[PDB]
């Protein structure tokens, strides 16, 4: 959460989701698109077989 | 405050400085308005209008554009040479001897090459040169 609030670009690079909650209704001022390549091209995700072959 | 004292000029327009403070004049004509302070700045508008149009894109300097004669010569030569290349490489490859001329020039250290001669004058002159080290 500290990383997301202070350095949004690094949070997006690492793939962290926006850690703030907008339940009050006002969207946050530093939201960004999700870069999930690191968490998706992994042995535990849709790239499981590709990562097994690469390993 | 240190107001501007007087303007010893016969041009009544310049007397506007007498109505302001020296600090104000420095702030708005010396610190960040140095390139704009007490200047007409008509050149700014002229250059903006010059840059924001669809005028000729051939540029030589920031002050002058390319010479139209040079531009036209370059364009005509480019078009004609491109047409020659395409036509010769697509239609006139049957007779290479008739379609192309053989020529070259080698280093002056080595003896003059047999093909080193002025084209269109090989029937009128023979070229040779003295080797150099």
């Amino acid at each position: 959460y500290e990383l997301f609030v202070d350095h949004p670009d690094l949070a997006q690079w690492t793939g962290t989701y926006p850690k703030v909650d907008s339940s009050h209704g006002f969207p946050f001022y530093s939201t960004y698109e999700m870069y999930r390549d690191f968490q998706e091209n992994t042995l535990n995700s849709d790239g499981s077989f590709a990562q097994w072959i690469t390993l | 405050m240190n107001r501007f004292f007087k303007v010893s000029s016969k041009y009544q327009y310049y007397k506007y400085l007498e109505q302001y403070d020296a600090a104000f004049l420095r702030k708005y004509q010396s610190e960040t308005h140095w390139y704009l302070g007490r200047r007409g700045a008509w050149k700014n508008l002229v250059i903006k209008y010059a840059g924001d149009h669809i005028s000729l894109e051939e540029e030589h300097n920031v002050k002058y554009k390319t010479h139209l004669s040079f531009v036209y010569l370059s364009y005509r030569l480019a078009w004609v040479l491109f047409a020659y290349v395409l036509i010769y490489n697509h239609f006139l490859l049957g007779d290479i001897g008739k379609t192309f001329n053989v020529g070259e020039w080698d280093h002056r250290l080595k003896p003059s090459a047999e093909r080193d001669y002025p084209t269109r004058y090989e029937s009128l002159y023979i070229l040779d040169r003295t080797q150099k080290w």
Binding site: - | V85, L86, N89, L93, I96, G97, F100, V102
Partner: protein, 114 residues
């Protein structure tokens, strides 16, 4: 359109190769092994670097990437135009080697007269 022209050139080179390989004895090149090798190399290079690449990365990419990414134009319209206009020289160079030889004259030309 340039890709169509280059593909026709490659098809012509393939036709030359197939006519030479139709039956033994070199019915097409009549013994010019060097010319046949040059034609084969020209065919391969033209098909690889000047048919499929222009079709995919030249026409299809330039036509589709703006649509599929939401851009008014490519980041380098000048470079796109340059890449388009640069192809013909390489295409000709890799396609006309079969015709062009340093020894242009034929075996029955009396070079001793010149």
């Amino acid at each position: 359109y340039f890709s169509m022209v280059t593909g026709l050139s490659g098809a012509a080179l393939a036709t030359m190769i197939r006519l030479e390989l139709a039956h033994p004895g070199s019915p097409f090149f009549k013994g010019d092994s060097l010319r046949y090798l040059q034609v084969v190399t020209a065919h391969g290079l033209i098909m690889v670097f000047f048919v499929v690449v222009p079709i995919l990365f030249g026409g299809f990419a330039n036509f589709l990437i703006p649509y599929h990414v939401g851009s008014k134009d490519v980041a380098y319209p000048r470079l796109n135009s340059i890449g388009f206009w640069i192809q013909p020289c390489g295409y000709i160079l890799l396609a006309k080697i079969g015709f062009l030889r340093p020894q242009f004259w034929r075996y029955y030309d009396k070079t001793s007269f010149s």
